[PDB]
Design a protein around this motif. Structure first.
Motif, PDB file in Angstrom:
ATOM      1  N   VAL A  94      24.942  -3.114  -4.666  1.00 51.68           N
ATOM      2  CA  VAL A  94      25.871  -2.814  -3.594  1.00 51.68           C
ATOM      3  C   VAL A  94      27.224  -2.306  -4.087  1.00 51.68           C
ATOM      4  O   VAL A  94      27.956  -1.657  -3.328  1.00 51.68           O
ATOM      5  CB  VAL A  94      26.071  -4.079  -2.702  1.00 51.68           C
ATOM      6  N   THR A  95      27.549  -2.566  -5.353  1.00 50.47           N
ATOM      7  CA  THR A  95      28.876  -2.241  -5.867  1.00 50.47           C
ATOM      8  C   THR A  95      29.185  -0.763  -5.670  1.00 50.47           C
ATOM      9  O   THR A  95      30.225  -0.393  -5.130  1.00 50.47           O
ATOM     10  CB  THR A  95      29.026  -2.613  -7.383  1.00 50.47           C
ATOM     11  N   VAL A  96      28.282   0.094  -6.101  1.00 44.37           N
ATOM     12  CA  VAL A  96      28.539   1.521  -5.959  1.00 44.37           C
ATOM     13  C   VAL A  96      28.585   2.017  -4.484  1.00 44.37           C
ATOM     14  O   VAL A  96      29.550   2.684  -4.087  1.00 44.37           O
ATOM     15  CB  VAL A  96      27.528   2.318  -6.773  1.00 44.37           C
ATOM     16  N   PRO A  97      27.561   1.699  -3.664  1.00 36.42           N
ATOM     17  CA  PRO A  97      27.690   2.140  -2.257  1.00 36.42           C
ATOM     18  C   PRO A  97      28.878   1.545  -1.500  1.00 36.42           C
ATOM     19  O   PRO A  97      29.354   2.192  -0.567  1.00 36.42           O
ATOM     20  CB  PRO A  97      26.374   1.686  -1.610  1.00 36.42           C
TER      21      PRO A  97
ATOM     22  N   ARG B 214      27.482  -4.448   6.224  1.00 37.58           N
ATOM     23  CA  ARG B 214      26.126  -4.958   6.316  1.00 37.58           C
ATOM     24  C   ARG B 214      25.058  -3.858   6.133  1.00 37.58           C
ATOM     25  O   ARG B 214      24.000  -4.084   5.514  1.00 37.58           O
ATOM     26  CB  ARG B 214      25.985  -5.662   7.665  1.00 37.58           C
ATOM     27  N   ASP B 215      25.337  -2.669   6.667  1.00 35.89           N
ATOM     28  CA  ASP B 215      24.407  -1.543   6.539  1.00 35.89           C
ATOM     29  C   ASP B 215      24.134  -1.222   5.071  1.00 35.89           C
ATOM     30  O   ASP B 215      22.986  -0.921   4.677  1.00 35.89           O
ATOM     31  CB  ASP B 215      24.957  -0.293   7.243  1.00 35.89           C
ATOM     32  N   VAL B 216      25.182  -1.297   4.257  1.00 38.52           N
ATOM     33  CA  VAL B 216      25.030  -0.971   2.839  1.00 38.52           C
ATOM     34  C   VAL B 216      24.021  -1.908   2.194  1.00 38.52           C
ATOM     35  O   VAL B 216      23.171  -1.483   1.421  1.00 38.52           O
ATOM     36  CB  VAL B 216      26.361  -1.046   2.092  1.00 38.52           C
ATOM     37  N   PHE B 217      24.117  -3.193   2.509  1.00 45.15           N
ATOM     38  CA  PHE B 217      23.148  -4.164   1.998  1.00 45.15           C
ATOM     39  C   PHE B 217      21.728  -3.910   2.522  1.00 45.15           C
ATOM     40  O   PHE B 217      20.743  -4.122   1.788  1.00 45.15           O
ATOM     41  CB  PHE B 217      23.559  -5.595   2.350  1.00 45.15           C
TER      42      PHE B 217
ATOM     43  N   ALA C  11      20.270  -1.124   0.886  1.00 40.72           N
ATOM     44  CA  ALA C  11      20.056  -1.516  -0.500  1.00 40.72           C
ATOM     45  C   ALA C  11      18.860  -2.435  -0.624  1.00 40.72           C
ATOM     46  O   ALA C  11      18.511  -2.847  -1.727  1.00 40.72           O
ATOM     47  CB  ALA C  11      21.275  -2.186  -1.058  1.00 40.72           C
ATOM     48  N   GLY C  12      18.224  -2.760   0.499  1.00 42.34           N
ATOM     49  CA  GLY C  12      16.988  -3.514   0.413  1.00 42.34           C
ATOM     50  C   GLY C  12      17.030  -5.009   0.701  1.00 42.34           C
ATOM     51  O   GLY C  12      15.975  -5.644   0.762  1.00 42.34           O
TER      52      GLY C  12
ATOM     53  N   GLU D 278      17.936 -10.722   8.114  1.00 40.92           N
ATOM     54  CA  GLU D 278      17.811 -12.160   8.128  1.00 40.92           C
ATOM     55  C   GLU D 278      18.401 -12.818   6.860  1.00 40.92           C
ATOM     56  O   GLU D 278      19.132 -13.826   6.928  1.00 40.92           O
ATOM     57  CB  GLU D 278      16.339 -12.508   8.301  1.00 40.92           C
ATOM     58  N   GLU D 279      18.093 -12.248   5.703  1.00 40.40           N
ATOM     59  CA  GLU D 279      18.554 -12.838   4.461  1.00 40.40           C
ATOM     60  C   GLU D 279      20.069 -12.651   4.319  1.00 40.40           C
ATOM     61  O   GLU D 279      20.792 -13.570   3.909  1.00 40.40           O
ATOM     62  CB  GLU D 279      17.800 -12.218   3.278  1.00 40.40           C
ATOM     63  N   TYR D 280      20.553 -11.470   4.700  1.00 40.64           N
ATOM     64  CA  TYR D 280      21.984 -11.193   4.648  1.00 40.64           C
ATOM     65  C   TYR D 280      22.782 -12.067   5.630  1.00 40.64           C
ATOM     66  O   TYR D 280      23.716 -12.769   5.241  1.00 40.64           O
ATOM     67  CB  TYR D 280      22.250  -9.706   4.940  1.00 40.64           C
TER      68      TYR D 280
END
Length: 188
Positions: A88-91, A109-112, A115-116, A120-122
């Protein structure tokens, strides 16, 4: 000497007990942090020159970007907890500073998601007390050194890197100097 207090590093007049060995602060709003991360790869080159048996820590800070700043500090807690710092650091950087598509927690949140990490997990991480104390640690560590600027590196709670006093003509040379300084301070 060749390394001198006030030249490549400053000394904290109020040392910080029990601090992480190599401690780094950044902000996704911080233009030099963007450089440090994507162009210079400072963390990674420091890592390459540290002894091993040394842990390297990076925390986000609140004092840039107001309400999104804090959101970003919680979201970095999430990344640390899930161990997806490297995805996630780069995006996050480019989304805050390049494309400017990060304007809300929801965009963060979209970036995560892209990023896959699963929604639910986020959202579960986001709301967890493990994340709360992780935010707390990030804030505490900045507080212990009265941190007013980023990027910032502190070694063993006692020395603060001073990049102002290093050559900037060649970027590769700036990195090695920076890293070598961390190693010197490490062994001090």
């Amino acid at each position: 000497a060749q390394y001198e207090d006030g030249k490549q590093y400053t000394t904290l007049e109020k040392p910080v007990a029990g601090a992480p060995q190599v401690l780094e602060f950044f902000s996704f709003f911080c233009p030099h942090c963007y450089q440090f991360e994507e162009v210079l790869h400072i963390s990674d080159n420091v890592k390459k020159k540290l002894p091993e048996g040394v842990k390297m820590t990076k925390y986000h800070v609140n004092f840039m970007g107001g309400d999104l700043g804090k959101d970003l500090t919680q979201a970095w807690a999430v990344a640390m907890a899930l161990g997806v710092e490297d995805k996630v650091t780069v995006p996050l950087f480019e989304g805050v500073q390049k494309t400017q598509t990060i304007r809300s927690a929801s965009d963060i949140r979209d970036v995560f998601i892209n990023a896959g990490i699963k929604g639910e997990e986020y959202d579960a991480a986001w709301n967890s007390f493990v994340v709360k104390s992780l935010v707390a640690q990030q804030e505490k560590a900045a507080a212990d050194v009265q941190l007013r600027g980023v990027p910032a590196m502190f070694v063993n709670g006692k020395y603060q890197l001073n990049p102002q006093g290093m050559d900037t003509s060649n970027m590769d040379v700036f990195v090695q100097q920076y890293a070598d300084t961390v190693k010197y301070l490490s062994e001090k």
